[PDB]
Symmetry: D3
Subunit: 251 residues, 6 copies
Amino acid sequence: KTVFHLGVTEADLNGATLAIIPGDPARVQKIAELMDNPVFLASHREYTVYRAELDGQSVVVCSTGIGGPSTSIAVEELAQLGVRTFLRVGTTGAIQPHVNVGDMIVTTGSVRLDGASLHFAPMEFPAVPDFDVATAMKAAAQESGATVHMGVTASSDTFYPGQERYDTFTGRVVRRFQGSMKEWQDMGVLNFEMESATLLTMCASSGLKAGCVAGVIINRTQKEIPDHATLKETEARSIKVVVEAARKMLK
Amino acid sequence: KTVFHLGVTEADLNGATLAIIPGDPARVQKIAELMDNPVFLASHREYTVYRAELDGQSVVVCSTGIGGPSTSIAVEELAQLGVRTFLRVGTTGAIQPHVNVGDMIVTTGSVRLDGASLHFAPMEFPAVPDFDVATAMKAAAQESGATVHMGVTASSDTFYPGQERYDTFTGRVVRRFQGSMKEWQDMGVLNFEMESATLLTMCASSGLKAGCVAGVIINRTQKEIPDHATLKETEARSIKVVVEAARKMLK
Amino acid sequence: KTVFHLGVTEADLNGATLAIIPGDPARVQKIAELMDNPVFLASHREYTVYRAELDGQSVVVCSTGIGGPSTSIAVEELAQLGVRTFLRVGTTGAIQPHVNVGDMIVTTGSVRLDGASLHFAPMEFPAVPDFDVATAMKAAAQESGATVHMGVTASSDTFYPGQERYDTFTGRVVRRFQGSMKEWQDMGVLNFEMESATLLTMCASSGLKAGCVAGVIINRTQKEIPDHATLKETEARSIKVVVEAARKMLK
Amino acid sequence: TKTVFHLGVTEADLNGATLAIIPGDPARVQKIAELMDNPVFLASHREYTVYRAELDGQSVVVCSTGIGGPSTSIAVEELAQLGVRTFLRVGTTGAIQPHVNVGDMIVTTGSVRLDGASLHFAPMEFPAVPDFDVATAMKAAAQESGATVHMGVTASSDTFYPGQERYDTFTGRVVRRFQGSMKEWQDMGVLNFEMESATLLTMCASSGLKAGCVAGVIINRTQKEIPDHATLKETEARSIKVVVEAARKMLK
Amino acid sequence: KTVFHLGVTEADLNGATLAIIPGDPARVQKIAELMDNPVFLASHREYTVYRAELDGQSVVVCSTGIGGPSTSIAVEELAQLGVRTFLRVGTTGAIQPHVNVGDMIVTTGSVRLDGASLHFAPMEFPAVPDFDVATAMKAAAQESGATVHMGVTASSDTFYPGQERYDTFTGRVVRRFQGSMKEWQDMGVLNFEMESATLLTMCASSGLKAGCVAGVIINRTQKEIPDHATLKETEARSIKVVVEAARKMLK
Amino acid sequence: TKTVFHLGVTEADLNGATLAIIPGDPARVQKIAELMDNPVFLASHREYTVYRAELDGQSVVVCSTGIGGPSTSIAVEELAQLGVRTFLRVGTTGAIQPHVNVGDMIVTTGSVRLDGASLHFAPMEFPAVPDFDVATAMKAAAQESGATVHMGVTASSDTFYPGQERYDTFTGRVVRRFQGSMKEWQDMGVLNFEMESATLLTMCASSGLKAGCVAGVIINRTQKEIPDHATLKETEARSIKVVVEAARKMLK
Ligand SMILES: [Mg+2]
Ligand code: NA
Ligand code: NA
Ligand code: NA
């Protein structure tokens, strides 16, 4: 049996029960090649799927696309094929002045500024990671030598108005999001992204283990775009960290 | 300047003020080749971008990925580059017994079961198309010989629970969506999809003209696999119709 | 055999399946007299009911009163007596500078700033007209020689605070409505009125065909007071247009 | 001289009135006014019929509201622009509790806000409650008329049909929000449904205006008995007699 | 049967069907000693319980603690033991300039700025007192010679941000509550407290009779500080008044 | 020097404490304080009993909260004014999952916000989340005690009765919102019910304070509604030993 969107079967996964889920399809091969015997399985729409081996055990790498809706499809269909643990990796921009480019963020909870999380649990339910995944990500990030921040991420269904950007076609932000960035800053939120609220809510309410780790590639309060060397090193560290976190999760 | 995600410039669009926006990146070239002088511009993440010419005028074709969040990025960045009219095309499944495979649906309004629409307008605001775009889509659809339905579409941030699917890993649907498919059926809703609420709300509240047309490729109330020829013909007709609707909007 | 509020039976309607529904009881006779053989049927509370003949077919004219609640009663009771198509006519202000006194607006969707719409469908559902009624209204309005605007109407349960009027007894506007007129202006909304959200939501979710057309008699953004002659012409044109729209709907 | 936009009257037309009786039906306005002295028709436009009269020498307005919070909110606002500060709603109603009998009177102590226009004056958390002096005067007038009086909560709906959980309709459907709602209100002690009190009471309690509602019971949803015309006629007449006596107590 | 939190039995109550419910456990004995034969029953957590006799009838005095949650436990457990009428007494701060220190407020309805009221009735339901109890409280307060205000009270789940206090650890007030005190002032709200919305909603929806009376001990709009004698007199008058209101409720 | 408004203490009274242990019941404050060095009573007002003690040479406060978010929010605010930055909640809880046994410990990783006071600090979208170091210390302290420990989501209710879907009550009714809610939380993997963690965690996570919750299971709601009182005394004793050891780990 082949799932509707991902184009793979349970046999294709070789017994994997853990997936690493980047957003960008072009990063899938790069993550798989950090492990042993990487194998391309399928690519359709924003979903590129590889398998590889980590300490002898099969691991899936599957892209999600941008946003909760496309992420929710990938997580569901991988769970149909036996995956139980989901490690999100990416890079991100921080919104607090003490966070530096090259630091890592491990999300301990997300502000649910999305719609798909409500398709799994009502708004009162916390978008929080599994404690073992969060523990493994913190340990892998710390062992990398980076400075690590554990804290809250704001997870938005838009890149522009929901992150209170005004440098846009209309220059307008709807009332709900006017003043929102300052509010999140004053509440200690570390960063914005666009998938964690869906991922964490769907997994925490469905018997699946999930977490999110990200390397910081810009501080939005300072707007200092990194040189190429620093960007490359931060991107590389983020995926090396997520693979070591997967290693810590294997049983 | 090059826009942040799509990787194209205003010059690359060569004057285009109208975009055709399918979901799947692999459909972009297939739409572009119905027009004159198609040229590939860029491909990043779920976003593949071509230009072409229709009756001497430039037209962009840009994929959106699945879901309102990735759609909202593409629409905003194309608008930054001068695009003012957005024609969504795709194929869909219907939820009314009287709608047959091969028929076309032109959306007159969407049920906002998404999150990104709320980043542009509060829930009270109607997710409705531009009337000229809807009229052009109806005319083009009828001129193709298909049976056309004008009506309401339910636009969900998930494929599974928000469309009241129970054939899933948990088999559960949150309270909000229990009994929902029958509620929408009794309210005359024609079909589910995953992008129109975001697209139509964002455009109608932002000075952009938008509409949606889709070919019906399955009927969820019927238990019948369509033949391959009928599916191919319906896909081909959907994109012929959207290009003819673009020709009507330009003229 | 009589419905509870309107005081008419199905036999009194002489087979009519289409109603013209103004708000003011005193306008019912005026609209009826534009058609053939007008006959007074009943008057109770805000509900004055006539019948007339248009191209040989019976048409009902029934006032609604101000607001969604009284409107919802008239629509339901007429539907119980066999009416399936409802054409709302009136006159309105406008909130966009480009809309002039004497122009006409055909609503493509309503902002649901009412309560009664929620008694038919949850807020996510679009308050949108039937496409054939909106098309007939656009055609009748344009054929009259008026400048016609197709677009979104804000439909408020109040005349005063929900339209952000400060020339009131308290001069207070509740937080929800502070700044709201500029927000709707920036979102492209054309006008305020007080019944379309209820009408359009109720009908679109209940298998009834509805639409709304209005003549513009004042513009909130303009200082010039309209010539009383232009007001009289606009009132007369509005009802001539809705009768022609009814002619185009007859089968 | 300028007239208010919908009601078609000026402050001078009211002869100093600071109290209004506000029925829903325009045809009941003259019937209330004639219980007082020197009733005079002022205007009729749309659902708004307006009379003045005198009670113990003081001017009183009588003005219909139409059905629903939206048309009611217009009448209250425009009357308040002309100096009216106290608003007494009267009408007749069904009841949803078995202990409330036809011919009894209900004085609303608070309303379930199943409307929209109340939200245009105060967020949902705000209570739709009457002025305590108005409710007190209504209770005293009702008791002095010989009727059995019930003080309690009224459910105030923007619809007559689905919001009152009626299924005998064109579609036969009731939206999810209102499925099971009649039994829910019954178990919470709610006495009756009507269609204007949540708007009226929220608008007035948040705007420095005094308001209350009294109604004669003319049917009981929970009963099958059909009241005859003399009983309905008696209940309608008593309801307006009671509201005029309540106005007298407010003016004293 | 011994109720779980309050630690009393029906026999301990000696037939009482009326309770006076202050917030502070230390005030229970003081209230009981205004009546005949005061007897300590139990003390656990924030719940101190006495019985006394008033005109020969048993009355309970039971503290609630601060907040709707602890109040809801006390009311429920007393109702299990036969109590049907609940008279809340306390002292409060007023937010209207015309309300003076030493005046008394009888609540005619509460703004539901709490959470526990929603555990008994949806937000649309009015947090309103029983009319007999409010009438008895008005009469007792007026007969004492105090100036009495009947009106709306804002009932907050917090002492600090929900009363728009900025003199706090963070100085932050969440968006919902920014500007809120001026909005309640403009709406004619008399005072803030922290239990009435829960108490009134719970009782009104559960067949129990409840009301609230308070003496004003501070006014947030007035700079002048009240003297010690005025405060001691106001605290003493508040409890004398509630006992006289209980007398008026006995049957 | 001024005392805080409700707690009746000054910063000097706390001897520089930056960590508080916050039980609900005033009578348990002394029981926790006596597990540390040099316990001293500071104040008692309303439901707030406050002691100071010393742990490995560092000052620690113990302060009761009362039942519910509203009284808890006062105590946390006023302790934070006096320099407290870390808050360790200890208490008992009712488990809702069948695999959790009486006497097990639960460390909350996030709370379902079935309260009102959390909304006075952050909108509903914001996660009621503990500080990660506090949750890590609580888990380690609970494991080191020999207890079986569960990490997971807690449903945090403003009521004991209907919001925890209890039916053995005066009316026997539960409002629509909460009908079927316990099964819904069970199917979503929620471990337990209590009444303060949503307020505590949301207020601290949005205000620069570190907080966590640990609780001993005294009842399993898949079995019964009201708990039994033998290992309960034993469960309470182990829970407070665990929270003191978690405090030691946070101070190290
Ligand atoms: Mg730096
Ligand atoms: Na996507
Ligand atoms: Na009306
Ligand atoms: Na308490």
